[PDB]
Scaffold this active site. Sequence first.
Site, short mmCIF file in Angstrom:
data_model
loop_
_atom_site.label_atom_id
_atom_site.label_comp_id
_atom_site.label_asym_id
_atom_site.label_seq_id
_atom_site.Cartn_x
_atom_site.Cartn_y
_atom_site.Cartn_z
N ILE A 15 -28.89 -11.52 20.79
CA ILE A 15 -29.21 -11.73 19.72
C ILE A 15 -29.28 -13.17 19.62
O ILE A 15 -29.75 -13.91 18.79
CB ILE A 15 -28.42 -11.44 18.57
CG1 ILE A 15 -27.10 -11.89 18.54
CG2 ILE A 15 -28.49 -9.69 18.45
CD1 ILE A 15 -26.28 -11.61 17.36
N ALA A 17 -28.29 -17.38 21.73
CA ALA A 17 -27.57 -18.09 23.05
C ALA A 17 -26.54 -18.90 22.39
O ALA A 17 -26.46 -19.45 21.18
CB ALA A 17 -28.49 -18.98 24.07
N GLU A 19 -23.08 -22.05 23.86
CA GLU A 19 -22.88 -23.12 24.58
C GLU A 19 -22.99 -23.05 25.95
O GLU A 19 -23.71 -23.59 26.90
CB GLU A 19 -21.60 -23.89 24.31
CG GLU A 19 -20.30 -23.39 24.87
CD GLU A 19 -18.85 -23.19 23.97
OE1 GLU A 19 -18.98 -22.49 22.98
OE2 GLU A 19 -18.08 -23.83 24.12
N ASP A 130 -23.73 -29.28 9.82
CA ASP A 130 -24.85 -28.48 9.87
C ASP A 130 -24.88 -27.32 9.04
O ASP A 130 -25.66 -26.32 9.32
CB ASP A 130 -24.69 -27.87 11.61
CG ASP A 130 -26.01 -27.36 12.28
OD1 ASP A 130 -27.05 -27.86 11.44
OD2 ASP A 130 -26.44 -26.45 12.86
N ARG A 134 -30.14 -21.78 7.66
CA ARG A 134 -30.20 -21.02 9.17
C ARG A 134 -28.75 -20.56 9.29
O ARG A 134 -28.83 -19.68 10.45
CB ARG A 134 -31.00 -21.85 10.07
CG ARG A 134 -29.98 -22.92 10.55
CD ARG A 134 -30.87 -23.93 11.36
NE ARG A 134 -30.11 -25.28 11.56
CZ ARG A 134 -30.68 -25.99 10.52
NH1 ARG A 134 -31.61 -25.89 9.87
NH2 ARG A 134 -29.93 -27.22 10.50
N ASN A 135 -27.96 -21.57 8.94
CA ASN A 135 -26.46 -20.91 9.35
C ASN A 135 -25.69 -20.22 8.44
O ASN A 135 -24.32 -20.15 8.30
CB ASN A 135 -25.73 -22.34 9.72
CG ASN A 135 -25.94 -22.90 11.23
OD1 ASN A 135 -26.18 -22.27 12.10
ND2 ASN A 135 -26.15 -24.29 11.25
N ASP A 148 -21.70 -21.04 11.72
CA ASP A 148 -22.32 -22.17 12.26
C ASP A 148 -22.58 -21.67 13.69
O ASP A 148 -21.88 -21.17 14.63
CB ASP A 148 -21.54 -23.28 12.70
CG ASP A 148 -22.04 -24.35 13.24
OD1 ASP A 148 -23.46 -24.46 13.32
OD2 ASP A 148 -21.45 -25.59 13.28
#
Length: 268
Positions: A15, A17, A19, A130, A134-135, A148
């Site tokens: 779903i 990517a 780090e 952040d 979207r988070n 996050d």
Amino acid sequence: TTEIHPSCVTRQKVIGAGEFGEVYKGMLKKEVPVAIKTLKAGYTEKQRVDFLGEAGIMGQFSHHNIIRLEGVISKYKPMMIITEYMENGALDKFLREKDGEFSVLQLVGMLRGIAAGMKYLANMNYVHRDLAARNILVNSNLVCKVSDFGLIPIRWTAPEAISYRKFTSASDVWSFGIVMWEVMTYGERPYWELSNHEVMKAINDGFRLPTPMDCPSAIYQLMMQCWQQERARRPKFADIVSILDKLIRAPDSLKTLADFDPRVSIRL
Ligand SMILES: Cc1ccc(C(=O)Nc2cccc(C#N)c2)cc1Nc1nc(-c2cccnc2)nc2c1cnn2C
């Protein structure tokens, strides 16, 4: 953090990517669906510290509006961070696919929830850096969980964090103001087509995002005060939560709307 055994985890679909490893949807053992972020072979020392550090802080968080950690796989490879799964997914895509489908009270309630999670993070001395629709994840009760997922979000970031990397709860408040605008517009892009440089220049020149359509005056006033240039003049998350809670509990207060500035005139 609870340590989960690998035999209790099944990765099903990619779903996203991470780090250094993918993020999966899966099941956790009757079976609970979960999100799984892996740290794959070859990860660096710094990557391991940031990964297990992330897992550690997440295990510290226990709040209704913060993504819940189910557990960690640290004793076996690949290592794993495992959270609850939120079937409605991220708030930004959610709102854009459900344009106009909610009441003003439902929207403000989402914001109250986000604010409560952010007050908890700020009180725990966790600076998000952040914060954006979207988070934020949405569950089947419309409850918003701050998360996050990783990445530079110039349009969501406070001037001092941009200019000289001063990230604090007060720069998170600025971001929360933008999130407020994302929610009341059903996921519009902040500043529309303006470039990152055009956004910074407009903000330094004193311009601010205009009121969303059909937006309670009190809500527009609150997001405008999150965008004070002077960091010290912005509300604290405690102020934000308290105002949102009083507004929801006296809902007629939301019936007064800010004037919307038409970008197009239609005369009939
Ligand atoms: C597994 C996991 C690991 C870490 C984090 C996380 O929030 N870390 C963290 C770190 C520091 C601070 C705070 C806070 N406050 C939070 C979240 C999840 N879970 C999800 N992430 C993603 C996802 C999608 C695409 C790419 N990356 C991630 N989709 C998900 C879920 C759950 N459901 N769905 C649909």
